[PDB]
Amino acid sequence: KKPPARKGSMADVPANLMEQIHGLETLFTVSSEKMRSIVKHFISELDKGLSKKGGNIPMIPGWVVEYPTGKETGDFLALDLGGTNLRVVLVKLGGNHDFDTTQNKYRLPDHLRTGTSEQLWSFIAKCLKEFVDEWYPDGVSEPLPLGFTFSYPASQKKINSGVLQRWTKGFDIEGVEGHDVVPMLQEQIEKLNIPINVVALINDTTGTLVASLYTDPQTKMGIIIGTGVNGAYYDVVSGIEKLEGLLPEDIGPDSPMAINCEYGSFDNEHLVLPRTKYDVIIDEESPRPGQQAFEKMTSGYYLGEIMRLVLLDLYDSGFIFKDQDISKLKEAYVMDTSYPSKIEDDPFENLEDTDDLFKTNLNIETTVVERKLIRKLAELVGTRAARLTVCGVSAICDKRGYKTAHIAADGSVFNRYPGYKEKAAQALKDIYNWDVEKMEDHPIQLVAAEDGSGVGAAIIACLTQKRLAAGKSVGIKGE
Amino acid sequence: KPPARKGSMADVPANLMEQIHGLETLFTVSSEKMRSIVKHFISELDKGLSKKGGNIPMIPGWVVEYPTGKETGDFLALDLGGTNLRVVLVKLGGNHDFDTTQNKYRLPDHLRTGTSEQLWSFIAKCLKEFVDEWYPDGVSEPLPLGFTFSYPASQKKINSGVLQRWTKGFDIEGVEGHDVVPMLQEQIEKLNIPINVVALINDTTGTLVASLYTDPQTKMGIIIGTGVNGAYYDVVSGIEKLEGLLPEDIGPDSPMAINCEYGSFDNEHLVLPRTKYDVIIDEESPRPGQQAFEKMTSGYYLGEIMRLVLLDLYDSGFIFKDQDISKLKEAYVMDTSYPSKIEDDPFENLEDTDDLFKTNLNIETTVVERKLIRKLAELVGTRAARLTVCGVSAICDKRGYKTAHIAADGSVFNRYPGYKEKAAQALKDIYNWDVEKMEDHPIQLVAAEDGSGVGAAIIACLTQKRLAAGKSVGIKGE
Numbered sequence A: 001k002k003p004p005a006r007k008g009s010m011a012d013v014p015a016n017l018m019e020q021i022h023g024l025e026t027l028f029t030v031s032s033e034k035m036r037s038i039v040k041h042f043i044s045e046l047d048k049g050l051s052k053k054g055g056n057i058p059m060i061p062g063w064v065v066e067y068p069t070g071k072e073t074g075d076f077l078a079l080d081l082g083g084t085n086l087r088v089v090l091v092k093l094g095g096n097h098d099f100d101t102t103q104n105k106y107r108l109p110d111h112l113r114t115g116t117s118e119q120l121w122s123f124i125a126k127c128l129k130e131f132v133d134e135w136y137p138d139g140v141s142e143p144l145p146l147g148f149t150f151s152y153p154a155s156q157k158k159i160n161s162g163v164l165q166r167w168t169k170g171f172d173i174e175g176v177e178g179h180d181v182v183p184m185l186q187e188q189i190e191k192l193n194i195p196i197n198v199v200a201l202i203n204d205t206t207g208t209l210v211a212s213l214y215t216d217p218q219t220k221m222g223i224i225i226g227t228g229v230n231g232a233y234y235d236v237v238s239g240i241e242k243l244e245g246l247l248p249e250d251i252g253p254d255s256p257m258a259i260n261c262e263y264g265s266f267d268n269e270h271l272v273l274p275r276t277k278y279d280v281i282i283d284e285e286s287p288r289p290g291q292q293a294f295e296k297m298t299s300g301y302y303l304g305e306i307m308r309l310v311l312l313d314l315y316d317s318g319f320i321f322k323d324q325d326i327s328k329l330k331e332a333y334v335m336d337t338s339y340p341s342k343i344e345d346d347p348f349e350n351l352e353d354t355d356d357l358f359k360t361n362l363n364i365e366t367t368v369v370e371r372k373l374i375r376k377l378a379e380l381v382g383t384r385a386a387r388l389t390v391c392g393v394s395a396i397c398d399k400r401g402y403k404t405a406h407i408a409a410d411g412s413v414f415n416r417y418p419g420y421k422e423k424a425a426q427a428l429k430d431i432y433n434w435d436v437e438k439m440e441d442h443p444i445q446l447v448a449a450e451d452g453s454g455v456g457a458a459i460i461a462c463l464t465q466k467r468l469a470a471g472k473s474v475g476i477k478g479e
Numbered sequence B: 001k002p003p004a005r006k007g008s009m010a011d012v013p014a015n016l017m018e019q020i021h022g023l024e025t026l027f028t029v030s031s032e033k034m035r036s037i038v039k040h041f042i043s044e045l046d047k048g049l050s051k052k053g054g055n056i057p058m059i060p061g062w063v064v065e066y067p068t069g070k071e072t073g074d075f076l077a078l079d080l081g082g083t084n085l086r087v088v089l090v091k092l093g094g095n096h097d098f099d100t101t102q103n104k105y106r107l108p109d110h111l112r113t114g115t116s117e118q119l120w121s122f123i124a125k126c127l128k129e130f131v132d133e134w135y136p137d138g139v140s141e142p143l144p145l146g147f148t149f150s151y152p153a154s155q156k157k158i159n160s161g162v163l164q165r166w167t168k169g170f171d172i173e174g175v176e177g178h179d180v181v182p183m184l185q186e187q188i189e190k191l192n193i194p195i196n197v198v199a200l201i202n203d204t205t206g207t208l209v210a211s212l213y214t215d216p217q218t219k220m221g222i223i224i225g226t227g228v229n230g231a232y233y234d235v236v237s238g239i240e241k242l243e244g245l246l247p248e249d250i251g252p253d254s255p256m257a258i259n260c261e262y263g264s265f266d267n268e269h270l271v272l273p274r275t276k277y278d279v280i281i282d283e284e285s286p287r288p289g290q291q292a293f294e295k296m297t298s299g300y301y302l303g304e305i306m307r308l309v310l311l312d313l314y315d316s317g318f319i320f321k322d323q324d325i326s327k328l329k330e331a332y333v334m335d336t337s338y339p340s341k342i343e344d345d346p347f348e349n350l351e352d353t354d355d356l357f358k359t360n361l362n363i364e365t366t367v368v369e370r371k372l373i374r375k376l377a378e379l380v381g382t383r384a385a386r387l388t389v390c391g392v393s394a395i396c397d398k399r400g401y402k403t404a405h406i407a408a409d410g411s412v413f414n415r416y417p418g419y420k421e422k423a424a425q426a427l428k429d430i431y432n433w434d435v436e437k438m439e440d441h442p443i444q445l446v447a448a449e450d451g452s453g454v455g456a457a458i459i460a461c462l463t464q465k466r467l468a469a470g471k472s473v474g475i476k477g478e
Ligand SMILES: OC[C@H]1O[C@@H](O)[C@H](O)[C@@H](O)[C@@H]1O
Pocket: A151, A203, A204, A205, A224, A226, A227, A228, A229, A230, A262, A264, A411
């Protein structure tokens, strides 16, 4: 039994502060009408991204050109390469929308993030060899098809290729950007005579879509709502004008095509996104000003920072923390996502969880009325983030004409942000005006995803291998 | 959650396998042993209710009725902890349902070593400032309050509590030996607050009552955490230590909530399947020879058992050869999160376990070592679960409950990995049921309601009713 929401009476809050809360409410509220307008623009930009001219939204073809039917069977590998860890996963598809996993994880030695190309790929291969040797001590009938989640910006002219465009997350390995990483990993596999074929390179959201669709046939989208944000869905080849002239005959106009949207870049021009002066500051102070605008409005990573800047603004205008030492509130990113999470979770009318948090982490003694403001603020910023995120869901559903859908979701915000599911479901209900009483009955609803970067990569490897074995294309002509 | 790892032992050398099988032998509790334990446990529960008494206190809770779920009204709960107090307003909606409004206050740090008036006046102040908020122009009835005061305390009636001894490092002059209820009540009065303290309870009693109010199948309340306790309803005719002391309106057939305090079961060290490691734990504890059942079922000791086994295996040449095991020598360095993280590890190479040992204990392990350590964490969590359900079985069997919800709370039941599955399989091994889904077990643990808040408030509701009516809530004369 988790506690009921606190009542959260505002009766005792001073007028001077109540006016400021009201100011922040008006500022952070996203109306049904504003959401539906954002969605309209979002749809144009999803289409723009697929067009020969392209757009701000990458809309990257994932080269998965069929839906998993759930009937697939067999043993497939996945490799998930993170910044600190890699996971090797063996997936046996049971052919009734079911699967079994056997998996290892290996911590990436600090060295590798800045070492040589051969060192990165030999370490990966050595992990693969240790894994395969244990699970297949007799060796193997046919090699194992492997799907490789390489979640770094890469371009693909076909699924079994991935040309690194730019390392992220502290990786500084020379000689890899501009090159196809698939042969790099494959030749280290070969050097160790490990029976594996690397057949697919994917982004993890694409894996999220496909794995969840294999187990849940109502899945129409995979979404990540966490430190970064992304969505993936199936479009149709006839709707991807930028592939016109590039496709072999066996990838026809009505072929499905999984798209990795990379929609974190939606509305960098801020035509529709409701930027406050706080989002302005967060943007101008970020590594990349003017970029990742939709990411900056929906990601878990900025939610405490938004609160921080708001609280500082109220301190400077003389509203709160009067005669407190707030020199810790001045540090950028000192309030991470656990701040509005802990604040929203507070079950006490006197908000004692919040009291402790602000006293112990930030050395600020709050009055009860200041806490009621902090909590109101936490709610508004959690709530707006969820409301903006479902604008992406709604754009993809509307573009494709999905009147019902399971949206398979993952990431730290969906999984752990307090009341996030309730917020998202209410936002969808507001957009569509459904006459439905309970969230479990929403025509469009977010559900917990399957493991995109392990299970999804292995199912993609299954789908891919079947095409490669038949000589069906998984990329543009000639590649 | 990911599925359970496969857990192959195929690569573990013979010398290590032999030791793993040795740990298995040591830490496995068979059905039959659980049964021998359940027979002696019942004997000790009957014993604690006798005139002579026994190692198990079996304290009458002076709740002499079941909640029907039909109760309605506004009630307060006060839950005094060592660091914090909680004040809860509970509105009962009369269909097994309730609503709460609650505040939590830090005790100023001087209260531990302050005066009697200091403690009660601060509590009353928290109450006043709570009631002033949620009731702008008072109310007609004073609010009945249930007080969870979880310090050793004797009661001849529910609306009394004589402090036996302070625990949790409290040190207040003038309280040990006196009824704390009038003490709190006169500070409430001295602040003119509309509150009537009608009940003083232990939290397990509240866990029982609150859960029975919401769930009619509740037959026991159990805490499995840092400490362990259980509470259930016996029958007044089964409480011989009460004969001659009771008024006629608490007759032979009357229900009586019992706070078992059964942590002290088997302090003689006669029946619980201790190992040499448990012996060390007991001998090195603050209270050697005390709380034997608690030492065998609390989550507090699960990592310590593991530390001692691993040390014994190091000393004996089997593991961590040429590792720096200094950190492993600190008693209680492995808290409950060790066996917990280890059991939760989803990887065949047990990487969660690897990272835990390297980062926290500076011990680098081999995969096969980690496989041992994983099997050990399992054995140890599994034994603690099976011993816990002996106490559940003992109570159920004593009362002829063939079917029961066991309303459970505490850090082990709530967070220890696969604890529910382990308890459910234990229960299934004892009774030999022919079932295949835990949701269909005749006897089963379910998540409890809030005992120390909601439960204290429901107990106030039931007590205020008897008081309003003139019905006894304690021994004759009291
Ligand atoms: O939080 C990270 C998420 O956001 C995006 O920036 C990445 O491309 C996703 O595929 C990823 O799962």
